[PDB]
Amino acid sequence: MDFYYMPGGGGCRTVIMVAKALGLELNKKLLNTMEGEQLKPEFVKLNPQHTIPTLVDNGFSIWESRAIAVYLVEKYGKDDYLLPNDPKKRAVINQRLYFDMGTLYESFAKYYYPLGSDEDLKRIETAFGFLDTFLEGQEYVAGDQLTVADIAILSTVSTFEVSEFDFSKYSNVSRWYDNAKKVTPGWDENWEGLMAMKALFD
């Protein structure tokens, strides 16, 4: 399956980790969006929104990182790995995925993409507080086992770590993060993508 991507991006790194966890091979096609490579007509035919990540899986084109992630698990995941069958448990996972996009990652973008006001820094703190509460009394963000929601939020929180946002006062988040780093497949490739992204801005 073809994976149109940039290695530093959080959405791209989420899919990378999910694919590694599922033991799936990605044929990586680096599209430099800083050089408008995502506007090539061959790519636009696959994804008319011409966004990355985009995965092409035997003729099937899908984009939005969190949609890709859930698709790979629903198609290739064995048993209840990373995603259960239960509507209730699945709903919590889905709410955490929208949290990750609309609240947690959104606060990252608002504060670091103007590379940032005190107000937007407060927005990050507020988001981390919610995540900390989400993690009260459980090892993972949506329950008792690693899910796609953990992997997505790891992608985001590791971006914060490398950008040097200090979340050490968030006891649950810090404990979750250390565990997630050890148990999540593909962390090494997440870290590589982050490290270049850091060396980039640095």
Query: Looking at 2, 24, 37, 51, which residue binds Na ion (CB under 5 A)?
Result: 51
- Contacts (CB under 5 A) with K ion, residues 177-196: 192
Per DSSP, the three-state class of 176 is helix
CA distance 24 to 103: 29
Following DSSP, what letter does each residue of 98-125 receive, concatenated?
Answer: HHIIIIIHHHHHHHHTT---HHHHHHHH
126 is in an annotated binding site: no
117 labeled binding residue: no
Q: CB-side exposure of 127: number of CA atoms within 13 Å?
A: 27
Interaction residues for a copy of itself, span 78-97 (CB under 8 A): 87-88, 90-92, 94-95, 97
The reply to whether 163 sits in an annotated binding site is no
For K ion, the closer CB: 106 or 192: 192
114 binds a copy of itself (CB under 8 A): no
62 binds, among Na ion, K ion, a copy of itself, none (CB under 5 to 8 A by kind): a copy of itself
- Residue 179 binds what, of a copy of itself, Na ion, K ion, none (CB under 5 to 8 Å, by partner type)? none
Hey, what are 96's tokens?
């955490």
Instruction: By CB under 8 A, tell whether 101 contacts a copy of itself.
Output: yes
Of 98, 171, 188, 201, the one binding a copy of itself by CB under 8 A: 98
63 binds Na ion (CB under 5 A): yes
Q: Mark 40-50 as b/e (b = at least 16 C-beta within 10 Å).
A: eeebeebbeeb
Closest CA to 28 of 159, 138, 192, 161: 192
Strand partners, 61: 56
Is the distance from CB of 38 to CB of 31 less than 8 angstroms?
yes
Q: Phi and psi (nearest 5°) for 29?
A: -120, 100
Stretch of residues binding a copy of itself (CB under 8 A), selected from 15-23, 33-41, 65-73, 171-179: 65-73
Residue 4 sits in the site that holds Na ion (CB under 5 A): no
Binding site for a copy of itself (CB under 8 A): 48-49, 60, 62-64, 66-68, 70-71, 74-75, 87-88, 90-92, 94-95, 97-99, 101-103, 130, 133-134
